[PDB]
Amino acid sequence: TSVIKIAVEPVNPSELPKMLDGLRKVNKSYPSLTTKVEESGEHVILGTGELYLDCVMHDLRKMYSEIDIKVADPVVTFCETVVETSSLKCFAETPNKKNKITMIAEPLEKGLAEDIENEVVQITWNRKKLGEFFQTKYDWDLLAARSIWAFGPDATGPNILVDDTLPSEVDKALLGSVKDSIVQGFQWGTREGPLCDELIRNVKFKILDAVVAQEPLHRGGGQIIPTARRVVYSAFLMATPRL
Amino acid sequence: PFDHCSLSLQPFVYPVCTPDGIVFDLLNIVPWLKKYGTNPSNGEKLDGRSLIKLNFSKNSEGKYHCPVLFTVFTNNTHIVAVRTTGNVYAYEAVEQLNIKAKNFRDLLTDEPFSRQDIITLQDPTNKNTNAETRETLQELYKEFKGDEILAATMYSTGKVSASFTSTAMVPETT
Amino acid sequence: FEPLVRDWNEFNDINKIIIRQPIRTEYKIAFPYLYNNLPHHVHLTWYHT
């Protein structure tokens, strides 16, 4: 797990393109040293350990680029989560007021998120296998398994977007229309974090009210995703942030 | 910063962005174009009908956020703008909602959009004093006439050597 | 020894830091390049014998 955070700058901003050449060369010569040009305008590096980062900057200042460069102090990359279920709802409706989405949030258990990380629950299965896995091990509902749509951040993200509101759920025309954008916005909110722009982990969101504009056309199709992630944030921030 | 003018470098209560990317507070950019038709972002003069208006959203806090994502727009958040619709939705919002899909429509309304109508507006990753004086100067310019004594009194010769080893003279160099 | 050679910064902003354990010269010498800007004419000595 790469966890250490190091921001770097040249002393005179003039030679920043050369500093960029150097950060290229280290990124190419190192396996998992990961650099990012962060929205604050900065250049952050994410790494493993003290000796690791030491020899990193040793080569950076020694070989690749010979500017003088300032270096901030080490810090961590963070995670976000909840402690208990979103006791109420804020529900987001598209810019053109066409789709009302009610969803809430709560905590999963650690183990199943661990399995999500283990690739043990690979949804590359059929929903049937999903159900076997889930109900078998952790007394999940079979219908909860039917309700699990996806996993958030990326291929392996420890959170789960679930859809459980039966009579409006059998609107498989409009919902089975909207699942794609729904998942886009979900993984959006999960990756970009509701509080501090770091990853969320091990959290369960449940869709309980999907009032879809009939023919959820490009109006929905386009103006649906920020609405979805705002639903995500509403649930989370409403009833219980945690670090 | 984000929502301040640039020629004033102060806040703009009503904005009108530049077709190039900055904030040209129309209230004074119209004074700038009505007194010297040029632009402060670029000293070259730029036409009038290009200064379109902009829409910075606002939350329960009033802050000039992005409407779509509900994301507060400050000096870090990437801001795109959609020209034809009149609305500005966050650059990440517009990007992942239209640069993944092929619905190149507006970001607030039901309107289409042009694949170049979105431009980056903010991205940190890129003497009458008294009667004594009046009557004095009257009588002076009246009764006062030109002067007499100090009027008159204001090898080589040696003015060079003199004026050189003496600062109390006007310098000849020849 | 006598010192070898002889304004504003942002990473030193006191509102953005978290001091949980305060840096000391032992650290600045253990990791010359991580814990020091402009580390010049430096030997990086380490031993896990």
């Binding site: 962060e38 929205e39 604050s40 963070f78 509080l195 501090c196 722009d197 770091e198 945690r242 670090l243 | 507060v72 400050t74 000096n75 870090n76 958040t77 | 509102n15 953005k16 830091i17 978290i18």
Partner: peptide, 19 residues
Amino acid sequence: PAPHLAREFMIKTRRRKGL
């Protein structure tokens, strides 16, 4: 002290990044 580690953590992390 411990009651406020995440409070600060957020304040300083956003102060750098989140605004």
